[PDB]
Structure formats: structure tokens, C-alpha cells
Amino acid sequence: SEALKVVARCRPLSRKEEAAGHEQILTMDVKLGQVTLRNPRAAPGELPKTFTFDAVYDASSKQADLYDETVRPLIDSVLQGFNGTVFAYGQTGTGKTYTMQGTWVEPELRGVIPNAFEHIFTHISRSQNQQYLVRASYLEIYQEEIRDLLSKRLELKENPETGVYIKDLSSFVTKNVKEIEHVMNLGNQTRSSRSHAIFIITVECSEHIRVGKLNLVDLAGSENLSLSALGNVIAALAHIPYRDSKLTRLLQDSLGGNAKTIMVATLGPASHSYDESLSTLRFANRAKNIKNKPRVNEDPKDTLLR
Ligand SMILES: Nc1ncnc2c1ncn2[C@@H]1O[C@H](COP(=O)(O)OP(=O)(O)O)[C@@H](O)[C@H]1O
Ligand SMILES: [Mg+2]
DSSP, rough: OEEEEEEEOOOOOOHHHHHHOOOEEEEEEEETTTEEOOOTTTTOOOOOOOEOOSEOOTTTHHHHHHHHIIIIIEEEEETTTOEEEEEEEOOTTTHHHHTTTTTSTTTTTTOOOOOOOHHHHHHHHHOOOOOEEEEEEEEEEESOOOOEETTOEOOEEEETTTTEEEETOOOEOOHHHHHHHHHHHHHHHHOSSEEEEEEEEEEEEEEEEEEEEEEEEOOOOOHHHHHHHHHHHHHHHHOOOGGHHHHHGGGGTTTHHHHHHEEEEEEEEGGGHHHHHHHHHHHHHHHHTOOEEOOBBOOOOOOOOO
């Protein structure tokens, strides 16, 4: 058993936003993992609300910090045959994509996905007397239709032993960071604030075989039936209605199941979005009272897939 780990990230205030006359209202205390929100429409005597998380990251926080401190251990577990999930929840414009992919490709500015690639293949090539098979899949849920970004409309099936899976989901084998970076490139080329993006990395490992799955999820902006389903599942967990959306059926394991999960609550510092921030913080605050039970995974001799 283990708690869902929630962390907060806040992007900088923009010139554009200050030009419009918007005050900053989000403050963080990085030592204490805390977020504080001023209500710009607050009565005299009212105290800001403070939320506490496992870690917080503010405007001056760098991409490597967030990776090495919060996410790197999740990916080391995946390398040892655990299932892991990272997902970014937040208002459009607050940095879900910046966090997950990066907007820039340079090593210092990459997001969690391209760093996970670096991490994974460095480990592999440091490894000895051990064969790893890495496969990557890249899909999108839009209007509760699963689309395959690397092909199409795909269907969801729930078999007894194996579990919940997707029919005909393409899944490319990747020897390199170069090769797995090409897959993500072609996926992005096929693709945004209304859709959910899921990047899946599997690592079969033989020394005698383990398998770890990693879901790297960039959700639709919290402003959409799937965000509502996720809203209700979290609330029940913290009868869970997983079947109310394609998204919550897929993340079934990451939310009260067989996986290590990290939520990245992404926030904007500005006064025009007090209510959207509040909603995110409250949601991130429920999420941290969710308990998963991650196990290490066996893998059959026969894992032949196309
Ligand atoms: N921490 C950050 N530091 C610098 N720029 C950021 C940060 N977070 C977001 N941005 C930038 O602000 C914009 C919004 O980020 P994005 O990830 O696209 O938001 P979302 O995907 O949640 O809609 C992008 O241009 C992005 O490059
Ligand atoms: Mg985005």
C-alpha cells in the first residue's frame, strides 16, 4: 500500500497578464511544500488559503529539479517491474504540456517524457547480464474516442487475467532515445486543450522476466465527460465509477490500484483565475488521500505483439 503523491507547479506571471492589470495571487513556500492563494475579491480580515503537498515548484523551479526529486524514483520503480503513472492536471495555459514534454527540446528545458527516455536508456546501457525490451505507445482520448496517434478509433476491452486493454494499439519497439524520441515526434505531428494525451512506455526485462508500464498523461484543461468522471472517481476514493469514462477505465490501476501514481497539479499565478486555481488545489488536495497497492509484475514467456 502507498499514497498517491501530489505536487504543485506554478508557471511565472506573464508580461501580458501584468499589462492587463492582473496581480499575482499564488505564492509558494518551497521548503514546506506549500501553496497559498489570495482571493482578489476577498473581504477585509480574510486570510488566504494554504494547501500542503509533498513538494511544490514555483516560477524559478527548473525542469531537472522536478524530474530528479519527484519523478526519477517513480521511473526507477518502473525499471524494477512496477507500473507507474504521471499525470498533469490544470487549467489551460498553466503548463501541463511544458511539464510533460517540454516546449523546448534542449536537455535543460525538456519535460518529464524526454527525461524519462534519457533515464531509461542510460540505465539499460549501464545494465549487465540483463536484457530490456522497451516499447512505446501514444494515444489520445477526445470526446471519449480513443485515437491512436501512431497509426484511428480504438475500442476498450476488459479481459479477466490480463485486465483492461486497447484493441489494435500500435506499439513500436525502441532501441534508442533517438528511436523513442521519433515516436513521440510522429505522435505530436498527428495531434489539444480539450483532448487527453497518453504516452505509454513498457519495459520488459529478462535476467526471470519483469514488466513495468509507465503512463505519461497530459489531461484536457480543467477549464468534457472524462474530467468529470475523474472528478467523481477521486471523490469516491478520497462504489468507484471507473466505467463512467474511457479515461477512468484506463487509469483504473493508477487510481486505487496496482500502480505508483504522481499527480502534477499545474497552476497560474494570476488574479484572473482564482476560481480555476482553487478548483485545482482542492482537487489536488483530495487526490493526496488516495491509497494505491503497487505490486511487482511477472511477465509471460509469450509476449508476442505487433
Ligand atoms: N514553468 C514554466 N516556465 C517557463 N514557461 C512556462 C512554464 N510553464 C508553462 N510555460 C509556458 O507557458 C505556456 C503554457 O504552457 P503549456 O504547457 O502549453 O500549458 P497547458 O499545456 O497546460 O495548456 C507555454 O508557452 C509554455 O512554454
Ligand atoms: Mg497543453
